[PDB]
Structures are given as C-alpha cells and as structure tokens.
C-alpha cells in the first residue's frame, strides 16, 4: 500500500524472499528476490519493476551458486549502459562472509567474526576511511574497512546501532 | 566465475614460484605471504559455496597450494593444516562426521565411484 494510492494491492509475481527493494533513477520503484549453474548472466535473482510491471532484468545480478546461501543484500551504485544495467552490490551469507559484486562479479570478500549477520549500512567518515557497518541477531556488530575487506571493529551486546 | 578463481590461483602459483626462484630475503617473503593471503581469500570465497562437484577439484587443489606454501614458509607443519584437510574432506563427502580415518575410508570409496579429481586426492 502506497501513500498516493491508499489501496491494498497484491504483488503479481510469485516470490520467495525480497532481499532488497527501493527507488532507482529511471525506474520509479524496484524489488530484488527470486520466484522458485555458474553462468554470470543466468543469476536466478529477478529484479522486479513495481506496480505488477515487467521483471525488468534477469541479466547481471549475483550467480545462482550464491542463491542458496545469501540472506540480505544492500546496493552501493546502479549504472545504465543500454537497456541492460550494471550494479555494484553487497550481499552477505549464512556462512559469515561479506562480499563485493560488479555485474555479478564476486570480488574483495571478508570473513565475519560473529554468527548470523542481519543487515548493513554505509558509514562515509570523510577522506579514504569508508566503512560497511554490519548488524547481527546475536546483539553484536562489525565495522569493516571498504578499500580492503578487512574488519576494523567488532563490538558486542549492542542493544542498538545508529 | 570458476574461470576467474582458476585464473587467480594460477596467477598466485606463478607469483609464489617467482618469489622462490628470484629475489631478496625480504621481497621473497613479501610476495610469498602476499600469495598466501590470496590463497586464503580464494579458499574463503569457495569455502562459502555449498559442495559443488565442478569446484571440488580446484578447492582441494587450492588448499594444498596453501598448506604447502604456509608450512614451507613456517618451515614446519602444524595441526591447523590437518583441520584444513578435515574441512575439505567433509565437503567432498557432503556432495555424496566422526574422525580422519573413517572420513578417508568413506572418501576413497566415494572416489572409487570415479569422480575425476583423483589427481588432487592422492595429492592430499
């Protein structure tokens, strides 16, 4: 249900999980997820143009190899070379990894200390000191260096993080 | 993607060898532990996928390359390497629990099924 609509709409396409969602340039509203083996263009993770519209992309997302282990996703830039498109996107795994992707090209992986990570934000903090800040269900949190997927701090108990 | 990993290994292997053949006492060690960590990360990257019959050959290949390089720089073995072997073995079986000895017995019967990775296994 949107503001501007006020009505209970059903999502036409038949999904399992909705890792990521949000507005992008030229698209207006978008969801990530799936419906129901190592080819980069195959991916298994359908984009979905919101308002019961076309899938919009089944082209250069994460491999189906990772589709069995990822739980949450967080995008960090979206390009449009032609009708196609190009995303640098972070995922994270049931197996305590944090990953970099570019066109579903896995690079710069980190190994999380703690068990069962939950979500991630980005911290800017100025000139060349950029960080992904990762939450867990276990009431603990990480901040990993960007540049070098490399843990910077690992605090614990953490009722909340902002 | 298998391409890239294969590629990165091979790259790192040649890096390793070049440091070995060539070099200064320092710069050798620099490129060595460089490639070591490379192999770690490639290890971790694959250690992050479920089982994967096609990946196994490289997996086992990779970890060997590590242990060898690891232990050689260390100039001595340790039991972390036995655990690395334990892990990779458990993965092999997960494709098709108790201790190293039953694992190997069950392993060599699963290989006598002739999945084509034996080149690594005898290596292991």
From Swiss-Prot, chain A:
Assembly information from the UniProt record: Belongs to the multisubunit FA complex composed of FANCA, FANCB, FANCC, FANCE, FANCF, FANCG, FANCL/PHF9 and FANCM. The complex is not found in FA patients.
Reported disease: Fanconi anemia complementation group B: A disorder affecting all bone marrow elements and resulting in anemia, leukopenia and thrombopenia. It is associated with cardiac, renal and limb malformations, dermal pigmentary changes, and a predisposition to the development of malignancies. At the cellular level it is associated with hypersensitivity to DNA-damaging agents, chromosomal instability (increased chromosome breakage) and defective DNA repair. Some severe FANCB cases manifest features of VACTERL syndrome with hydrocephalus.
Biological role stated in the UniProt entry: DNA repair protein required for FANCD2 ubiquitination.
Signal peptide region: none
TM regions (residue ranges): none
Name this polypeptide is given: Fanconi anemia group B protein
Subcellular location: Nucleus
From Swiss-Prot, chain B:
Effect caused by changing residue 60 to P: In FANCG; associated with a mild clinical phenotype; disruption of HES1-binding; no effect on FANCA-binding
Subcellular location(s) of the protein: Nucleus; Cytoplasm
Tissue: Highly expressed in testis and thymus. Found in lymphoblasts.
Ranges in a coiled coil: none
Illness the protein is tied to: Fanconi anemia complementation group G: A disorder affecting all bone marrow elements and resulting in anemia, leukopenia and thrombopenia. It is associated with cardiac, renal and limb malformations, dermal pigmentary changes, and a predisposition to the development of malignancies. At the cellular level it is associated with hypersensitivity to DNA-damaging agents, chromosomal instability (increased chromosome breakage) and defective DNA repair.
Function: DNA repair protein that may operate in a postreplication repair or a cell cycle checkpoint function. May be implicated in interstrand DNA cross-link repair and in the maintenance of normal chromosome stability. Candidate tumor suppressor gene.
Quaternary structure and partners: Belongs to the multisubunit FA complex composed of FANCA, FANCB, FANCC, FANCE, FANCF, FANCG, FANCL/PHF9 and FANCM. The complex is not found in FA patients. In complex with FANCF, FANCA and FANCL, but not with FANCC, nor FANCE, interacts with HES1; this interaction may be essential for the stability and nuclear localization of FA core complex proteins. The complex with FANCC and FANCG may also include EIF2AK2 and HSP70.
Record protein name field: Fanconi anemia group G protein
């Amino acid at each position: 249900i949107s503001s501007q609509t006020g009505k209970v709409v059903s999502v036409s396409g038949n999904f399992s999980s909705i890792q990521w969602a949000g507005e992008i340039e030229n698209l207006g509203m978008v969801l990530l997820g799936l419906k129901e083996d190592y080819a980069i263009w195959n991916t298994k993770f359908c984009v979905y143009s919101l308002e019961s519209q076309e899938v919009l992309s089944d082209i250069y997302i994460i491999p189906p190899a990772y589709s069995s282990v990822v739980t949450y996703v967080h995008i960090c830039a979206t390009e449009i070379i032609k009708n196609q498109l190009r995303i640098s996107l972070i995922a994270l795994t049931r197996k305590n990894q944090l990953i970099s992707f570019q066109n579903g090209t896995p690079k710069n992986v980190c190994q999380l200390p703690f068990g069962d990570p939950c979500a991630v934000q980005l911290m800017d903090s100025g000139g060349g000191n950029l960080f992904f800040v990762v939450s867990f269900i276990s009431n603990n949190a990480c901040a990993v260096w960007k540049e070098s997927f490399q843990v910077a701090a690992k605090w614990e108990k953490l009722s909340l993080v902002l | 993607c298998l391409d890239l990993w294969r590629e990165k290994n091979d790259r790192l292997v040649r890096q390793a060898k070049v440091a070995q053949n060539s070099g200064l006492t320092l710069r050798r060690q620099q490129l060595a532990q460089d490639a070591l960590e490379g192999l770690r990360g490639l290890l971790h990257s694959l250690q992050g996928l479920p089982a994967a019959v096609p990946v196994l050959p490289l997996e086992l290949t990779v970890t060997c390359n590590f242990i060898i390089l690891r232990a050689s720089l260390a100039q001595g073995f340790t039991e972390d390497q036995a655990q690395d072997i334990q892990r990779s073995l458990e993965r092999v079986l997960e494709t098709q629990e108790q201790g190293l000895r039953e694992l190997w017995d069950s392993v060599l019967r699963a290989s006598c099924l002739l999945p084509e990775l034996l080149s690594a296994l005898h290596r292991l």
